C-alpha cells in the first residue's frame, strides 16, 4: 501493498500490442463534417442515478472550443445540442468545400491545429476565412504555422522554434449539471484554459524553452504516442472543486485523469487485443522542484509511476467514473502512511523495472529507460473480480 | 465563501451566483519575457530570470492597425457583473419595491454600461505588459516579485523578509534563516473611483500603428547610461562587504 | 534599433558586466533599508507612472 | 488490428472510380487483375455508389496463404475482361468489411471438402507430377498442391482457369475422362479423384 | 549607388514597412524583421529569407515575395569597357584588367 | 449612389451599429465587424458573411 | 563590382609595407578602418529619382 491507499497484490498487468495511427485526411475531415447517425464526433455523458445526460465528451475535429461559453450560444438540452451542430457543421462543410474541391481527396493531408481551430473560430465568429488556405500541410504540421500570424492569437502563437496552442474543453458541461455526487467528474476540462501545450520538433529546443520560461505549476510529457508531435502540456492554477472535502488544481486533475485510465486499462489487458496506447500517463518533468515533498502533486506522480510499471488497483474502477467514488480515492490518497514500494519519481528519465510486463521500452525511441538495478518481487497475470452475491453467505 | 455549497440557492441565489461568478471568470496569472541576461545581469530573485509575473492574462497584438473588440477576461468580467445586476433587479423579492419606468431604465443603463466601448480592456491585454516588458530593465529599482496567486489559499505569500546576521553560534544561513527575520513591507491605497473610469472610458488616437507609435515613443529612452552606472555602484557594494567581513 | 560598427579598432575599456551573484546581493541590500518607508516607494511608483 | 497488407491472411479492398459507361483503362484493369492475382479462389463482392459526389466502386475480397501459394506458380498474371463490370449502371449500396464473413457457419459438405483437400495436400510432395481425376466445384487443386509441382486436370466442362504464363507446365482439357485411349499420352505419378466417381 | 549591398536595403524598406501584414523568418531571436533598413550596411547581416527566396511562402508574404524575385532578377548587371591605351600612357590599374 | 460598393456599406453600417449585440463571422483580423464601413470600397473586401 | 552573390563581395582595403617573408608587428594602414570598403557618403534620394 500500500502507499497511502491499498493497491492490488502480485498481479500486475500491462496491455502488449499497440496499434499503429493514420493521419488525418481531408477524406476524413469532410466525412466528420456532416455527422451521421453512425459516425459522430461528440458521445454522450450521463449520470448514473438519474440516467439523464450531463456532459458531453468531444472527439477530433471539434476539440478547440478554447472560449467562453456564452460567445457560442449552445443549448442546454442534448437533443437540441446536437440538431444544432448537425445544423451548423453543414454551413461550415460547403465552405471548406468551395475553396477546396472534393476531387482533391485521394492522399491529402490536412493540417489538425487548423482543423480544430477552423470550427473553434467558426463557431465562435471570431475570422476563419485567413485559417482556410492553410489547410493543407507542406513539409511538416508545424512549420507551416510558425512563421504565419493569420489566426487569432488565442488559438495558437509562436515564440521561435516551439508553437503554442491552447487545448480547450475535453468534456462540455450541459444544462442539468448540479455537481451531484452521481454525476460524472469532469477534471477541470470543462472550463477555457487549464493547460497549454507546446510543439516542436526536438526536445532539446523545448528544454531551452524551458530555462528562460518558468515552470512554476508543473510540466507534463506524454513519452509514448505525440497527438501531433512531441510536446509538452503545461498546467495553469485554475481549480476544479468537484469533491467538497478537496480542493484540486488544475494540474493535479489532469494527473489523475490519466493515472486512473492506466489504471483502469492494466487489468483489461488480455495479451491479445491492441491499445492506442501502452501507457496513458504523465510523469512531471521540470516542476518537481517546485511541487511540495509528501503533498498531491507528488503522490499522483507516484501513482503515476506506479500505473505506467503496471500495477493494479484494490478496489475496482468502475466503467464510468462517479464524483462520490473519486472523492473517495482522493481522501484515501491523501491520508498518512508510508511508501513500500521501491520506486521514486526522477526528473531526468521515467524509468521501468526489469520484470515489469510493458514493452513500451523497446517501442518508443527513448524518455522510457530500462532500469536493471531495481526489481520488484511480483509475478505478472491479471486480477480476477466477480459479482457481489448481496446475501450473507455461511463460512467455515 | 471557500466552499461554495455552504451558500444554499433556495435562501441566497445571487450570493451563489457572485461566488460562482468569482470563482469562475476571475483573471489568472500569466509570465512575460523581458531583459539581456547576457551584458545585464538578472536581478531578481524568487523567480527564475528573463520572466515577469503579472497578475492578468495577455495576448501578443496580432495586427499594427488596432480596432474594437470585445473578446477578453476583462470584457467579460464587466458583462457578468452587468448581468448580476440585472438578476438583482429581476429578483422577485426586490422588483415590487420599485416601480414601473424604473426597472426599465435600469436594466437600459446596465444593458447599455455593459456594451460601452472602451479600448482600455484591449490595451491591458495587448500593449500594457510589452511596455511593461520594455520600461522594466531600466529602472533604478529593479522588480522584486513574489508569486500572484489566483485564488488557492495555500499558497498565498505572507512574509517576505530579509537577515543581516547569524544568530548565537550556529553558522549555516539556512540554520538562522529562521529566527533571523526582518518582514519587509508596505501597503498603499488607492482609489476605486479613478481606476473604475479609466477602465470605462479609455480611447485611442484615430489612426495610430503601433510600430510607428513605439518607434519614436522608446528612441529618445535609450541614450541614457544611468543602467550602466548602477551595475558599475553594485559592484562596489557587493565588494565593500567582503572587505568588511 | 541601434547600430555597432565593423572594423578593426583600437582596444577600448568599458566595464559594465557583473555576474548574477553581485546584483542579487546589491538587491538584497537595496530591499532592506527600503523596506517599511513607504516614502521613498511611493516617489519611485509617480515617476514609473 | 488495423490491417496493411503485411500479414499472410486478412482482408484487402480497393476502389477506382468509373464514371459512365466508360470502357475502363489498362491501369484499372492491371488492378483489378493485380486483385484477382492477389487473392485467388475466394468470393469477391462488389458495391457501386456515389461516394463524396463521384461514383465509384470497390472490390473486397480476403486474401490467404494457399492464395498466397498459387501466386507463386505463374510468371505473369492474366487479365479479366471488363465485360462484366462495364454493364453495371445500378448503385449497390456498401457495408463495413469483416474479417469472417459467414456468419451462419461452414456447411458439412464444405466441411467434409476441406477434410479431402487436406488429405491431398498432406499426400503431395514438392517436385512432382500429379494429375486431377475431376474439378469438383471449383478448380481448388492449384492452391494445394506446392509451387513447383506441375500439374494436369481433366473434366467433363472447359474450365475457367486462365491459360498460359505458369510458372511450370500445367493442361486443361476435358474429355470425359471413363473413356478409353487418353492416359497413355499423359505422364503423372499419382491421381487424385475426390467427390467425382459417384 | 556604389553600395555592395544596395538590394537587402531596397527589400528591407519594404520589409519594415509591411510588418503586421505579412510575416518572413530570421536567423534569431534578436533582429526582428522590423529593424530599420539603414542597419543594412555590411555583408554579414545579410537575411537567409533573402539569400534564398524559398524560405518566403506565398501564402504568408505574396507581394513581399514578388518583390524578393524582382530584386533577384531584375536588377541591373555590371558590365566593362575600355578606355586609355597600353603600349603607352602606362596603366594605373590596380586588381582589375589594365 | 453609382459606387458598385453601395450595397456592402449599406449592410455593414448595421454590423458597426452592433457590434456586442450580436456577430457575424468575418474574413480576417483587419476588415473586422467593428472596423468603420466607409473603408469597404473594393470588391476583394466584400466579406463572404 | 558584384551584385547579389555574397561570398565575392569586399570588405576591407589595406596597404602593406613590410616585404612578404618577414614576421613583423601587424601595422594595418589607415584605410582598414572604415566600416564600409571606403570612406562613406551621403547623396539624397530626391535629387537622383
Not at chain 1, 51 to 57: D, G, L
Not at chain 4, 67 to 81: M, T
Request: aromatic share 10%; glycine share 4%.
Amino acid at each position: 501493498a500500500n502507499v497511502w491507499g491499498v493497491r492490488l497484490a502480485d498481479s500486475l498487468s500491462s496491455p502488449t500490442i499497440e496499434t499503429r495511427t493514420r493521419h488525418y485526411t481531408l477524406h476524413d475531415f469532410y466525412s466528420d463534417l456532416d455527422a451521421s447517425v453512425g459516425k459522430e464526433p461528440w458521445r454522450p455523458l450521463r449520470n448514473q442515478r438519474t440516467n439523464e445526460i450531463v456532459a458531453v465528451q468531444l472527439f477530433r475535429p471539434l476539440q478547440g472550443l478554447v472560449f467562453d461559453t456564452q460567445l457560442y450560444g449552445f443549448p442546454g438540452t442534448f437533443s437540441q445540442w446536437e440538431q444544432f451542430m448537425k445544423e451548423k457543421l453543414r454551413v461550415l462543410k460547403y465552405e471548406v468545400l468551395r475553396i477546396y474541391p472534393i476531387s482533391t481527396y485521394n492522399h491529402d493531408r490536412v493540417n489538425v491545429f487548423v482543423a480544430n481551430a477552423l470550427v473553434g473560430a467558426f463557431l465562435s465568429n471570431q475570422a476563419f476565412y485567413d485559417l482556410l488556405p492553410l489547410l493543407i500541410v507542406n513539409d511538416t504540421m508545424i512549420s507551416d504555422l510558425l512563421g504565419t500570424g493569420a489566426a487569432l492569437s488565442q488559438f495558437f502563437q509562436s515564440h521561435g522554434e516551439v508553437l503554442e496552442v491552447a487545448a480547450g474543453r475535453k468534456y462540455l458541461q450541459m444544462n442539468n449539471y448540479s455537481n451531484d455526487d452521481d454525476d460524472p467528474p469532469l477534471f477541470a476540462k470543462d472550463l477555457s484554459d487549464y493547460a497549454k501545450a507546446f510543439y516542436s520538433d526536438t526536445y532539446e529546443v523545448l528544454d531551452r524553452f524551458f530555462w528562460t520560461h518558468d515552470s512554476s505549476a508543473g510540466v507534463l510529457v506524454h513519452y509514448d504516442k505525440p497527438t501531433n508531435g512531441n510536446h509538452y502540456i503545461l498546467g495553469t492554477l485554475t481549480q476544479m472543486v468537484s469533491a467538497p472535502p478537496h480542493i484540486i488544481n488544475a494540474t493535479d486533475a489532469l494527473l489523475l485523469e490519466s493515472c486512473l485510465e492506466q489504471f483502469a486499462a492494466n487489468v483489461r489487458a488480455r495479451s491479445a487485443q491492441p491499445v492506442t496506447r501502452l501507457d496513458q500517463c504523465y510523469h512531471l518533468r521540470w516542476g518537481a522542484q517546485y511541487v511540495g515533498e509528501d503533498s498531491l502533486t507528488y503522490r499522483l506522480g507516484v501513482l503515476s509511476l506506479l500505473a505506467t510499471n503496471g500495477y493494479q488497483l484494490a478496489r475496482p474502477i468502475p466503467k464510468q467514473l462517479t464524483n462520490r467514488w473519486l472523492s473517495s480515492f482522493v481522501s484515501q490518497v491523501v491520508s498518512d502512511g508510508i511508501n513500500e514500494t521501491p520506486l521514486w519519481p526522477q526528473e531526468r528519465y521515467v524509468q521501468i523495472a526489469y520484470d515489469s510486463p510493458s514493452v513500451v521500452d523497446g517501442a518508443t525511441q527513448y524518455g522510457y529507460v530500462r532500469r536493471n538495478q531495481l526489481r520488484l518481487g511480483m509475478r505478472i497475470s491479471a486480477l480476477q473480480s466477480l459479482s457481489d452475491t448481496p446475501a450473507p453467505v455461511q463460512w467455515l | 465563501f471557500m466552499n461554495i455549497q455552504l451558500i444554499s440557492p433556495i435562501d441566497a441565489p445571487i450570493l451563489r451566483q457572485w461566488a460562482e461568478i468569482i470563482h469562475r471568470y476571475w483573471p489568472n496569472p500569466s509570465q512575460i519575457r523581458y531583459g539581456t541576461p547576457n551584458v545585464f545581469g538578472s536581478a531578481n530573485l524568487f523567480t527564475p530570470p528573463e520572466v515577469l509575473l503579472l497578475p492578468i492574462d495577455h495576448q501578443p497584438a496580432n495586427v499594427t492597425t488596432p480596432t474594437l473588440d470585445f473578446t477578453n477576461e476583462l470584457t467579460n468580467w464587466r458583462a457578468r457583473v452587468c448581468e448580476l445586476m440585472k438578476n438583482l433587479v429581476d429578483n422577485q423579492r426586490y422588483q415590487p419595491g420599485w416601480t414601473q419606468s424604473l426597472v426599465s431604465s435600469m436594466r437600459g443603463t446596465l444593458g447599455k454600461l455593459k456594451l460601452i466601448k472602451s479600448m482600455t480592456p484591449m490595451y491591458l491585454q495587448q500593449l500594457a505588459p510589452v511596455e511593461l516588458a520594455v520600461i522594466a530593465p531600466m529602472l533604478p529599482f529593479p522588480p522584486f516579485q513574489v508569486p500572484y496567486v489566483r485564488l488557492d489559499r495555500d499558497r498565498v505569500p505572507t512574509m517576505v523578509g530579509v537577515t543581516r546576521q547569524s544568530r548565537d553560534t550556529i553558522t549555516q544561513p539556512a540554520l538562522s534563516l529562521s529566527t533571523t527575520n526582518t518582514t519587509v513591507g508596505v501597503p498603499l491605497a488607492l482609489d476605486a473611483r479613478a481606476i473604475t473610469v479609466a477602465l470605462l472610458s479609455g480611447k485611442y488616437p484615430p489612426d495610430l500603428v503601433t510600430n510607428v507609435w513605439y518607434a519614436d515613443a522608446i528612441y529618445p529612452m535609450y541614450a541614457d547610461t544611468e543602467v550602466f552606472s548602477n551595475l558599475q555602484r553594485d559592484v562596489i557594494t557587493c565588494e565593500a562587504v567582503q572587505t568588511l567581513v | 534599433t541601434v547600430t555597432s560598427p565593423y572594423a578593426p579598432s583600437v582596444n577600448r575599456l568599458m566595464p559594465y558586466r557583473i555576474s548574477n551573484a553581485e546584483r542579487q546581493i546589491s538587491q538584497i541590500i537595496r530591499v532592506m533599508n527600503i523596506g517599511n518607508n513607504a516614502t521613498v516607494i511611493q516617489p519611485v511608483l509617480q515617476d514609473i507612472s | 488490428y488495423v490491417d496493411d497488407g503485411s500479414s499472410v491472411t486478412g482482408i484487402e479492398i480497393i476502389s477506382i472510380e468509373n464514371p459512365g459507361f466508360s470502357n475502363m483503362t489498362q491501369a484499372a484493369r492491371v488492378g483489378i487483375s493485380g486483385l484477382c492475382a492477389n487473392v485467388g479462389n475466394a468470393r469477391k463482392s462488389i458495391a457501386i455508389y456515389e461516394s463524396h459526389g463521384a461514383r465509384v466502386l470497390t472490390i473486397t475480397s480476403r486474401r490467404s496463404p494457399a492464395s498466397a501459394r498459387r501466386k507463386a506458380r505463374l510468371r505473369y498474371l492474366p487479365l479479366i475482361d471488363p465485360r462484366s463490370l462495364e454493364v453495371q449502371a445500378r448503385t449497390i449500396l456498401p457495408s463495413n468489411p469483416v474479417l469472417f464473413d459467414n456468419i451462419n457457419g461452414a456447411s458439412p459438405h464444405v466441411c467434409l471438402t476441406m477434410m479431402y483437400n487436406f488429405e491431398v495436400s498432406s499426400a503431395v510432395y514438392d517436385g512432382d507430377v500429379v494429375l486431377d481425376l475431376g474439378t469438383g466445384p471449383e478448380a481448388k487443386i492449384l492452391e494445394l498442391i506446392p509451387s513447383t509441382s506441375p500439374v494436369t486436370c481433366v473434366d467433363i466442362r472447359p474450365t475457367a482457369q486462365p491459360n498460359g504464363c505458369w510458372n511450370v507446365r500445367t493442361t486443361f482439357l476435358e474429355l470425359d475422362y471413363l473413356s478409353d485411349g487418353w492416359i497413355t499420352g499423359v505422364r503423372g505419378d499419382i491421381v487424385t479423384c475426390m467427390l467425382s466417381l459417384g | 549607388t556604389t553600395d555592395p549591398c544596395a538590394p537587402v536595403k531596397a527589400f528591407m524598406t519594404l520589409a519594415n514597412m509591411m510588418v503586421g501584414f505579412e510575416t518572413i523568418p530570421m536567423d534569431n531571436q534578436i533582429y526582428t524583421q522590423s529593424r530599420r533598413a539603414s542597419a543594412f550596411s555590411t555583408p554579414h547581416t545579410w537575411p537567409r529569407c533573402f539569400m534564398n527566396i524559398q524560405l518566403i511562402s506565398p501564402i504568408d508574404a505574396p507581394i513581399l515575395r514578388q518583390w524578393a524575385e524582382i530584386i533577384h532578377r531584375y536588377w541591373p548587371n555590371p558590365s566593362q569597357i575600355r578606355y586609355g591605351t597600353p603600349n603607352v600612357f602606362g596603366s594605373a590599374n590596380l586588381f582589375t584588367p589594365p
